[model samples]
Target chain A: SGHRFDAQTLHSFIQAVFRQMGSEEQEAKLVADHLIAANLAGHDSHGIGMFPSYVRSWSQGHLQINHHAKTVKEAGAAVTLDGDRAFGQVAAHEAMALGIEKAHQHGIAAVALHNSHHIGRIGYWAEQCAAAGFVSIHFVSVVGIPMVAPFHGRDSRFGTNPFCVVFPRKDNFPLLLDYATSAIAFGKTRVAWHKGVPVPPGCLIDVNGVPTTNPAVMQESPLGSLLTFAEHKGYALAAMCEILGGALSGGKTTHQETLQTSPDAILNCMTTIIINPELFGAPDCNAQTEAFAEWVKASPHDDDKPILLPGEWEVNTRRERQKQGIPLDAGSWQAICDAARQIGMPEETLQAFCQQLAS
Target chain B: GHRFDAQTLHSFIQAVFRQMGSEEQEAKLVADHLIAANLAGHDSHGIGMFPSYVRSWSQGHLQINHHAKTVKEAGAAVTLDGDRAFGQVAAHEAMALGIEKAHQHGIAAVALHNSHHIGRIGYWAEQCAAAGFVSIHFVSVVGIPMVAPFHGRDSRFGTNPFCVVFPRKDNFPLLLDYATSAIAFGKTRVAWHKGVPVPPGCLIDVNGVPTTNPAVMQESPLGSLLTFAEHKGYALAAMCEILGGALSGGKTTHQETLQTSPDAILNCMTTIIINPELFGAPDCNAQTEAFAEWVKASPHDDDKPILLPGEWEVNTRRERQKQGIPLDAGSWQAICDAARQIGMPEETLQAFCQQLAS
Candidate 1:
């Protein structure tokens, strides 16, 4: 029951929805591109699945329209941006752009950002820096609902809390490693819940603190908490992210404050570090990294799937889906259609757009 | 069987390094580092490895009395070529320089290559924390590979230790040092020494089947050690090799043929230092300590306590300091043999040990 739509058509429709929600032409285009790119890269959770939520956030005045993120603090090679409750994609893009600019002059730069809406697909920001020939590491934490449990503890303490590192490559795709510190992402749990499937063991514990696989335990009150990936190690990493990203950015931490449960009230804090490897006197960094990539891939393997560098699969998937067109699950499309209508897009207009795509 | 005094042993070790032609100060420093590692709950990498170093030096595989050379420098960052110097000497100087530079500039990075095995990486992190700086170190190997990849059977990566340090006030700084494997190779040796099986999921036999036998890894054409925590840990280990080993110009993984089993050791490391106060509030230390306090307050069901990073080692050090450092019999015997081989006055040393023990 899923429907296939050309990337261009979907982009236009998404952009139109953004424009109707008070985004300027360029901002609308940027948001559309970022969201669609996630779809193309196979991260549907951050792709069109976010459209309804974002529109709801905008309607509730949680995500401000026509407002720009502002710089709140500045030090030499370091800066912080106050997102002003603006869309996170725009704020993060602006922050990284400033970081890239500063790094070009100082050889390195760090940008701390807070009070922004959900930054869609953090790898997008890493890719942004990598495309500029800079290496970047992003530590991000959310200030809304806590979903992940601390190591050896049963109660929820923090968001999934992502950590990403991207190494710039000369020719090949950058080596990008982005992962949530949780055993599985909250999105995966949502998918499991929707499909009525049991999550893998070690992924979660019930509200009673007993180990469980039922993903639905996460939806209700007194909800079960997701476990940190790899037990203690992942928990440590998540704590680091909260300290570096949340507290450093002046955002609330899980221990310091519990966020209001309103969906629109969530915010993100991020600490982004950008480095210019060329300044390290390693002009051959790219060459060496490429050689290492080749060496690692040369290892003997028995699995049917080839050993892949991080971000390699996404690049492959994006290229394939771009040509074949993106497929939207029936449920996702239905929700998107409903969201479009709820947000002032006439039902006839969407129907006409769908008819044109079908024709 | 375990009667050696820590101070006496340290002095003897210092004398041996001096006898091996190192300058008095460098020898003293190396001895301090090695002994401190033992005191701080990392005996696997401490004095136990000294006998091998002396042997390697005798066989011309290790270098002594060498100085590190600065190969490259950039804004707030520098690269050092270890010049086949002693790992202890090189790592100490590199970290000191990095901390000093970070003090001058809010952050600094030092990439070191071509060093012999750097003893107990946590020592460097602890060094940074002592200097009031937060630090992280990534270490990788060029010659030997012992850890298996996430989804593969054969060994393709090194243990690739990663260490992170965080500075706090009114208490000990948090030193988070861990290898990117389910268990360090030293843990396996300990299991073997105890004549016990390893925990399941920590190791695999030669056929890629999970095995509890610790001796499987010690065999010739050894079985591989699994990566820690499955894929996330494997990814991190790969990043360490990339950032520390390959990026530092020392080579990567087991792909390079520069390794020769027990000869000509080469290790590379990347150290990053940051001033926490530079990024966060001036009250950052208080904030950090408070957060730690809250994190540790979560209720526990098991008798075992929730241990913070580096807390276990600190606790061990305090206990050991009160009741003299305990040395394993095998390690103690090996060190005694090494001292004897170095032509130390064997009877005098034994008498000194007996007097100290009494």
Candidate 2:
């Protein structure tokens, strides 16, 4: 059975392991907070489970532990940055800060960043922009990681590219639309494989391009591929993500030349457009949006099940999960424990922290 | 079956609209948009829609020869009222202004409200792409709602569309254009006409049970179209209503705005046009070609070659131009019927058809 842990304890434990890996105090805490936040928002795929991946990336020298985003180019209301292989939790935060600053100056801004290591949960980046009272749209490409096949293709040709848009509101959580263009996230297959479950139909295919439900095809040899959501429509969006996120950001797209030779080197490029909504002439934007939200929520429904706006699920999940605790699958928890030891944390100390967290 | 070359069909359509009181330029614009849609292989928004436009006009919902009127303007943003004019005309004007503003100021946002059935959103995106700019559009049919909100039992929004386009150096512009619905409502109509079932996961019957039968949408006990990708597509649709409808100073799909007749389609849209030259990535074209070439090389079934965004339309348009556009007998008859309503003689249409066939 999986286990539940105090969110704060898990955060501290994650930070401790990162600090042992030579990350500075603030950088380590930033990653810990981000992972915990992902869990609190119910995205277990991007939660504390990703720490092992980052540890492997660092040990492989693909992730720089404490580097920040380096400004590579600057123009009128447009800026480009190099992540310098830094942990994206830190680099993306820096990128958004600069993007937000430019939006304030120009009423709109475009920020592009390349060579970041694993920008988790695109919604997190959008959330940062929204917190600054700006609307942001993001196109992100998973560089060098091809886990998804193009529409009608027999093999993997692209990663689970993600598209996200966030709209801020007064007296409400920002409306967020964020998802991988693939039918399911790559981490989802990993989760299903570890938990011994089948993924939903139409989400994947095997090596021969045959429909499959077994998640092992993704995690094992003779690997298969994920399908884009909504067939050709999703595939087109994924292609756009590659063009905008990778090409437009001055990064590499997933071609034969760019395919990853090392499994642990997870990298990404993102292009984001941040806009100030007040620049629009509609004085009634807020009221009209509120009315539409109320109208949709009023749709009659079955008991205990009601319609929700885009980000309402995350908002609701955070409320309940924060009150109770964050759950981690038993296998995932074990891997995290192993990762802590791999990072040079004393096994005794890791065991003590695990025992204390579980208790 | 009726087949007509692009120019012949355009002339016939222009003639019919001119007979209906549209000026020469207005008629030509409508002809251009409709023929372009058919050539692009989107039969749903092509000339098959002519009969509905005629009816909407006769029913006093659509007005002829009216131009888009500016309602509000700020720095780089503007709002226009369609004045119930042809969506082709209104959206064309809106996009032209947006392109100009974007040229003047690195970016521009233009909104159009109360427009009548903006045919195909991709057409507007293509205009920006042709101007060498990046454009993203959010569009909503403000008068009727046919799609259900995610987790809801009934319909509360239209099949709102999202479109984005990027220009390449020596290739067709990359375009990702689609309704947020799993399948367009027109696809169901086509299926019902052929007495076939639509693909699964696109519809729910009146009782909210999943169905593949297209009759659910055509019959009295109307069903709701589901969003593509479930919650993700639904959320995008909702944003369309907010950005295209509310943020454009237009009406959202509330009960008050429901069209009394289904043929009276009204649209609202918010489009953002950005100057691509402003970006620092000078190698964009090379990187784009690299990705496009790689994706097409994806291993696939002999006939199922991977296509880049907008490639499908480009191929379709090319083949269609060579082979002529195909229209079903039923749609052809309906168009003729509407043409007659505009006072065109049957002999004139017959002569036009003969000339097209010859």
Candidate 3:
């Protein structure tokens, strides 16, 4: 096996980001943890794969460096925030932190944020609340260009909105659900295209109203559209996000923006976070989670694969990765190296850092 | 088509339900409404088909008569009540009322109860909300033996969970979505068992796999399952009602009870009502609705059927039926005749009511 990069490797990456953004160390560490968590959970979409986009946005002066979001208005039970185009993770972390604090004071709290970007793998934010011993529900909306089609229509009408809910468990794991309203992400389509793989039938259709396995069709013309998952179910969820996350929160919606406008490929996003009072009011929150975990694990195994609650496997993966050190494949490593060079970092220092990144 | 005597009909049904504990008016109204909605849209599972079960439950004294559920709490944000084993319509109506009040004041409202037997086309409630210019999202966890098996298990785990979401538009008709969690209900199987017809890929085998045919599988105990609309998607929604409706609401779940529970089906339900601020805050909600109506209507001409969201055609059917009375036949006539014999009402009164009923 290749040499590994331990926690220090991530720490170093955070340190580098801290210096680059002129952000405080704690904020950088928080951002680092979020990104690494995405990777550890096996989601490349939101992990280091996004570094280039972040850098591009930073260079374009869209991602306000060292900027922190502010709560624009507040109610006894809820608050709204303006992200000011800050780094998405930073905005998300701040908003969730606000929700967690408010929820502790009140029996329940809700936080909504507007003008933010890529609140990455919403589960991370939910886990933030769950780990605090609260039941949390999250909804995200993209108000710009729609990548997913409404049912029966060959055209796009809604974003691939994502929703997540997390229940804190007594066990080391949580009942975490993170899913996009669409059947699959368009990034997955891109990956499938590169590999010349056929997407599942229900996943997509072309502008001509014909279903096609050919990813190239999606690449050109009116392009193929990602269908919502469960067709109507996903459509309902997306509409809810528009209503709950966008309209209610006073944010934009898929009917409003486009990918062409944001060169960094960051879409305008809206998010809402809610906390349940039962976590604090009742003593049995953990007990219920433990019971649920036990029940889920007891399901009969098929093909020797044990039934698992949502975030269980990810927790196991992180534990192993933490011990063995995260492995960055050669392609990604080279890309990072190129990025550091493009940033005008000392060539010798960059090489030394890359070498030390391995375990 | 057949002429049915209403008085004789009630009498005949009462006789079959001679052992039923529910008083005359209670059973009659519940049965009638169920039958009416079935003819409206849910021919698959309507009141006429389940009167025997209602009678059985009544005989068993599982269903109570003339009871009123007291509201335990009510407010702008939340409302809770324990159904006093009264008719489910009472519970449904009360929740709808609370939801409407919440729409006027709060960003969202939640109303819930623990009573079961709130049958009929579940979408009707959502249609009511949309008609009044509000969006409503409701999830229900019904009582009933589990019909949907887990991914690879032979036994079912939950009742047919249903969800309805309705959105109001101005010139555009309201949109309502109603769906069952179970791939197929007993009604679907009943048709298939009778060698009539069945939707493809709705039922499954003991191995927890899917099938199109309705033959009951024993070695691999076969069951009809709902289409998640996809496999995983169905599971995702079923799990939601378990958490949001049952667990969160402190109600019973399918896992906690079997098909044989004396518990009046405790349908754990949750409803969220949203006010469409888009039309007013921007232009008018009705204008946005009108634009959508025109667009959807524009697509109607070709091979493609013009579709307005859910429950639109069903409403059209109701309007048409109101204008021209429905013709009852076959099983419908059987239902009326059976009721007549049981009640022993005068033949002349029965005849008069039959024409009136039509």
Candidate 4:
């Protein structure tokens, strides 16, 4: 069973929690905006469900409140910035702003941002560039945390690195490609484990590195590693994420020296490229893109489902959730409530807000 | 299995291209590209493809020794018309211009359109790396599509390929190069010739039902190849068609642009080159080594040890250089057919084949 909260109500609660944690007004709002945006896009794993961990990270001083991205290097078209353990909502936003500005000047720009705290939903960063009339691509790695194994490896060797791309469209939503290199996200296993259900095959293995569907292997002790998608292909892609995001960005990768000791300590490094499509000679790009989209949609398929271009799913979900509100499972709601309390929300006050929203 | 020394094969390929009216440098470039692909274990993109190139030339589709012409130039972005030239020459010129622009601006983009089959994308990526630059490529073919879009009935896209390279210090660069399809079209051709079934999930019959028989792809009742990971790979392939084809001032695969002959393998590519030293990371090389070392240390069965991104190619090149490049008999005969078609005399063909093609 789950309860649905109006988007505004959830946003208010998130902002309040961050404010109580000593975040500045703008900082709190940025965190609330990003988390709520993820919910609106149907990415529940990256939504309010992440707040419990964020609170813990802040409590342990792993995540710094009221921090900003600091420029470490500023070359002609390349910029490297240190995220200073700030909320990725703030750092990545600031990083993309500089990246877009540089791209406007040079027709292309590359930005490397390191040490951000849990950059949720990489597509959001791509969207920022798209909104500015630029095409952007990102390679991201989770620093000091390993959950995904190499193709034939017996143990986890890297994070569920993400690769994202965005191409802006005229009078339409942009084409966005964003996904983890893993067969399934680590949060997916946690979600499956919560309900005692098995995940899809080729996603997980047991402690002994034997294939299994049981999510318990991830939630319980002696955790098994998540496999890369499409075997060697995704493994190769994931390796680039580590090298490009962590190594190229001057951030730490998952190694004996850098692996996090606690699950709450999440950091991210990203390498991003932003390009202005208008600089290309093809003035018919938009029309050509629309034509290709229509041609692919015309492909024969099951009567119920049509071929969807990238980001269409998110768009559909955003519209649907706008009216129906965001659904939060009872477990996630309770966890978030407990986290709100730890962040100095009085029990009565928290319950009162919850009753108004959860009613 | 048939084997040939790398140089022996290279010389024969150069001689054939030379006979086809290619200039000295163009012939050498083409020969070097094909042989490099073979050494890197991508036989589908190696010398076996010369038979199709020969046919393409004979049909007046491929021009000899023509160079890429600058169609448009913006600050850090340039568009080049390949003029139906050999992809080796066109792509080489494109990368050279891109490398020069990147050195000046810290990053550059080169869009190459209407080239004839830029085989083995990693070869271009390796060039960028060899010049101490990182590169990303999106490539598409403007011919009969051989792969289907996700949930689509028939083929709507070519086996679009994506590639990236990160140069390292005194080590093989970290490279990611692969087609969006579950297997290259050439793989199906090879399996059909061998009368063997392809691995499951790599193909669908013309009726859109799963099949292991590669014959569906080789015969008249043509089938389509599946994307690597269904929706994900399909999305990537579509992007390649848009970025590599449409955005590069080329045509995307559609009814209007479909080739009448299978030999017309036209190609478009969009490449971005970046100078890594421009980034703030001074310890990038050391950090890369650390991650590579950490990943390779994963425990596994002796036969299935974990490998880094470019390790397979590096290992294959080393072994093939010492031993010899192996080829199937069908591919060996096809190359010979192309060599003879170019009037390289039967004796000259047999003379080279006898040395190491045992």
Best by DockQ: 4
Q: Tell me the tens digit of each residue's lDDT in model 1 across B1-358.
A: 4744678768877877776678998788789888888888888777787788877777775688876677888887888878777888888888988888788777678888778778788899888888887777779866677777766666777778888777665566667677788887888888888899887777877776778888977765467788776877877787787778766656675455446655455678988777766563443455455656666665567765666667778898788777767788888788778877867787856765676576
Backbone clash count, each prediction separately: 3, 0, 22, 0
lDDT of 3 by residue, B1-358 (tens): 4433334443444443443445666666555555444435554434354444444354442355634343433333354443435334445555566556544543344545454445543444454455453434334444343344334343333443434334454433334444445343554545654665455545665555666556643122454354454444444544444443444343433344333442344454444443443211232243234324432432123665434454444664466455532334555654555455445355644664555566
Superposition TM-score, candidate 3 onto the true structure: 0.79
lDDT score, candidate 3, position A316: 74
In angstroms, the error of model 1 at A128 is: 1.4
Stronger candidate by TM-score (2 vs 3): 2
What's the DockQ for every one of the candidates? 0.45, 0.70, 0.19, 0.76
lDDT score, candidate 2: 0.88
- CAPRI-wise, candidate 1 is acceptable
> What does chain B score (TM) in every candidate?
0.93, 0.98, 0.70, 0.97
The C-alpha TM-scores of every prediction are: 0.94, 0.97, 0.79, 0.97
- Local accuracy of candidate 4 as per-residue lDDT tens digits, A52-101: 89888888889998999999999989999999999999999899999999
Error of 4 at B209 (Å): 1.5
Please report, in order, the local distance difference test score of every candidate based on alpha carbons. Answer: 0.78, 0.88, 0.55, 0.89
Which residue pairs collide in model 4, if any? Answer: none
Considering the true interface contacts (CA pairs under 8 Å between chains A and B), give the fraction that model 2 also has: 0.64
**What DockQ was computed for model 2?**
0.70
Report the lDDT tens digits of candidate 4 across residue range B4-26.
Answer: 88998898888888977898999
Quality class of the docking in candidate 4, CAPRI style: medium
> Of models 3 and 4, which has the larger lDDT?
4
**Ranking, DockQ, top scorer first:** 4, 2, 1, 3
State the lDDT at B143 in candidate 4: 63
